[PDB]
Structures are given as C-alpha cells and as structure tokens.
Design a binder for this molecule. Structure first.
Ligand SMILES: [Zn+2]
Ligand SMILES: [Zn+2]
Ligand SMILES: [Zn+2]
Ligand SMILES: [Zn+2]
Lengths: 257, 257
C-alpha cells in the first residue's frame, strides 16, 4: 500500500566553498575492480582492511570515478571528465551531473586532465563525436597562480609517466585535485606501500603517493580524489603508521563562514 | 569571466536499499552547538578529538539534523521530522527534501518519533498550523514485524525518558534508526562515556549508548543517526577502545545487488 519505490539516487554533485572559489564535485558513476589488482599485501590483510571499512569485494570493489569543476571567478575549470561510455553504462554521468549542478558544458573554458586514462579523458567526447566541452582549452600533461590565477601544477608521476595533480589556492585555503594518487581508500591510506596493477610504474607511483600523502597531511590541505568515495573531498590525517582519510561533512555553503 | 557561482547545494536526500525496503535519508539543516555542552572530558582531549576529524569548534560544532523515510512496500514511514522553524532558518528542510526525493507528505501513512525534542517533533506542524503529514498515524514514545511489518521498537532511554530507537529488517538486512544515541561522531564513538548537557539523564543515556553501540558493532547492522553527518547512514566498528563510525559510500541503487 506504500507508493512505488522511487529508486533514483540524488544527483551526483556536491558544492563546497574554497575561499572565494566554488568547488562542484561531479560523479561519473562506478566501476567494479577486482581486489586482486591491488598488490604488495597478503590476501588476508587485504580482506581485513576491506572488512574494516565495510567494503564488499566478492564481486569486485565498487570504485567511484569523480571529476571536479572549480569556479575561480576568473575561470570555470573542469578537472578530468569521467569515462563517457569507454567502460560501459555504469559510468559516463559527469556531464549530466555538471548540468544538474546548474552549469552548462559550453561554459567550461578550461579542462585539466590529471592523466590520459579512459576514466579521466574519454569524457572529452560525446557519443556523436562532438566535443563535450567545445569552448575549453584542454591541458594534457607531458609524459596569476601559474597555469591560471590560483591554479598550479603538482607533478605526481608514476600511475602514468605524465600523471599530474592540480593545486587550487584561494583565501588561505588549498585544494589538491590529485587524480589517481590512490585507488582504494580502505587500503592505501593505511598501507600506501600497496600498489595497483595498472600503475604504469608502481614503485614511482608509490613514491609519489607517499610524498603527496605526507604533504597533504602536513599542510592540512583539502584533497579531491578521482577514486575516493564521492564527493571525494576531505583531508588526510597522519596515523602512527600510514594515514587516514577524513571525508568532508555534508553542509550547505554558509554565508557566515 | 567565469559565470556567477551557483552557491546552491545538492538537495539533502540520499537513497539506500535495505533488502526490499527503500531508505531515503532526509536533511533538515544544521545547528551550531557549543563544544562546552559535551561533558566528561578535558577541554584539551575534546579539542584533540575534534581536530582529529577536522571539526571546527570556535563558533560551535555545526551539527546535522536528519530524518529518515523508509518505504517498506507495506508502509511509507517517516522517522523524525526535523525542527521546522523551532530553532531558526538553518533548519526546517526535511519536508522540502522529502518532496525533492520524489515523495509527497500526503503519502506518509506513519510517523515514528524517536523522542519529543523540537529538532525531531516540531516538523509535524507547518507554518500555517496545518499538519505536515496529515494522513499519518503518529507514534509517540511512552516516557508482521511488531509495530508494523518489518518494524520494531528498540527502547534506548536516557537522552529523554521515553527515548526510542526503531529497527527495520528486510532480506537479512537490518537498519536501526537510532535517534539521539549520540550527538557528536568525532567524540562519542571514540569516548562513549562523554555526555551531552541536554540528555535528561546522562548516566542512563550513556548506558544506553554503550549498549546500543556494542550491539550495532556486534550485529554489523546499518545505523541511521539523527545527528551523524548527513546522510547519517553507516556502520559501527569496535576499536581497541571505544568505537568508530563508518559512513556509507555514495552509490546508486544497484539492480545487480
Ligand atoms: Zn588512472
Ligand atoms: Zn582513474
Ligand atoms: Zn534530542
Ligand atoms: Zn536531536
């Protein structure tokens, strides 16, 4: 006698203030990744780490893919673009969420890619072959502020040779849109030594991860992570061993802050 | 040259499957609570606990107020109703989010109150004096399933004498909509001994909290918490000392699960 269930999820966007900038986190969808792709750890310990965060793995680890839209006043900047249809119908929702968040793709004047992997770059092209962001300058990493006012490059090579993170600064606040520094929040904060099979260079990716985590924890900066649980926004805390992820708490943007 | 900032936040609803039931978490807004209202802990340790979770306290702890709408197939059930205008304009958004989530208040056939505090009960009445949920049977705690199919009472006295939690079970899964078992996730999971000044009976509230946390951790049940960071959904994990909150990871409702 209840009405039919609605099913539908809330739209995959989330707003956060960062000084005078506005951050809109955008969800692309998810992909199931086998836990066996994580290496450098015993099966038992891996499963314990997953169970600790109540992450199911029997049918693979459901992994989020996020992109970030930052309105700096000077520019509307999109970092990564999701996967379009490259990895199937559970992904490709970034542009839809961009629209849901109150912007249009024609407004994006800059697209920054952390790296060229499908789940970051395929979203540049619509199903009919038309450019998803037709008015944007697209920045591809090489295998005021600096790049733009308030926006600078933070090299983070390893996952791919040209893998790059982007730093946004406004009003004393900093946000690092870090790309694929890590793929599994339940394992690689606690044990950054753990690597991903599809890191092009796993040793290097691991070195960059250790460094970036140390810096993020030390400087208490905000992090925006392509494969962290959506909205993928939060801080890194140093633990006795390894690190912990602290996600932002849902909040409207406050005028009195 | 960027467009104007949108400001607006994504609507405050979140969908989760629980067996054959559908859970819609609903955000009422927030209230700033002084950290001085938490007792049983030194100032220093309290501040350390807050800083650990990156919770600002200089202007009070911004605290979420959540309600929960569960479609059990048999009933559309709302647990708590937010504050309406009882605590000012930063609250009172539950009904708005209920509408945003695709339901209408006329559809709610049952309202369960965890307790009679303003931030749970004031939402029963619209600004013009009309009933917010005019077709609902309202269950006030006394100072199949059992109450309804799949729905049972879990007494949790202390915060108020009649304070009550509600258990929903479907398809082997359980969700406890627990009310005000705790008020600050950054302090009272790690240190359940810490009490709230406006618990009517702080010793009793603390006993109920210890018991409920132990049970939630042991039985691995889902928890829906009125003052946990929205959507307020997740699990409780037992630590060497005290407990930890593990929030659900954003996900659509999956057909293949
Ligand atoms: Zn990648
Ligand atoms: Zn990726
Ligand atoms: Zn209360
Ligand atoms: Zn309350």
């Amino acid at each position: 006698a209840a009405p039919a269930q609605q099913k539908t999820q809330v739209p995959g966007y989330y707003r956060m203030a960062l000084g005078d900038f506005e951050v809109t986190a955008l969800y692309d969808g998810y992909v199931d990744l086998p836990a066996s792709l994580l290496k450098g750890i015993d099966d038992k310990d891996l499963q314990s780490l997953l169970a600790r965060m109540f992450v199911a793995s029997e049918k693979g680890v459901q992994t989020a893919v996020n992109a970030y839209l930052i309105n700096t006043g000077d520019n509307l900047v999109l970092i990564d673009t999701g996967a379009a249809q490259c990895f199937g119908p559970t992904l490709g929702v970034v542009q839809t969420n961009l629209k849901a968040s109150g912007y249009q793709p024609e407004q994006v004047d800059t697209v920054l890619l952390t790296h060229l992997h499908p789940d970051h770059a395929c979203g540049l092209v619509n199903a009919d072959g038309s450019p998803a962001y037709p008015n944007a300058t697209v920045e591809v990493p090489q295998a005021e502020g600096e790049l733009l006012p308030g926006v600078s490059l933070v090299a983070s090579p390893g996952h791919t040779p040209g893998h790059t993170s982007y730093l946004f600064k406004s009003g004393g606040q900093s946000l690092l849109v870090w790309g694929d520094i890590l793929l599994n929040h339940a394992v690689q904060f606690a044990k950054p030594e753990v690597v991903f099979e599809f890191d092009v260079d796993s040793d290097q990716a691991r070195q960059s991860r250790q460094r970036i985590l140390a810096e993020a924890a030390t400087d208490k900066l905000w992090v925006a992570g392509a494969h962290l649980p959506f909205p993928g926004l939060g801080h890194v805390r140093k633990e006795a061993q390894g690190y912990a992820w602290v996600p932002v708490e849902f909040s409207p943007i406050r005028s009195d802050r």
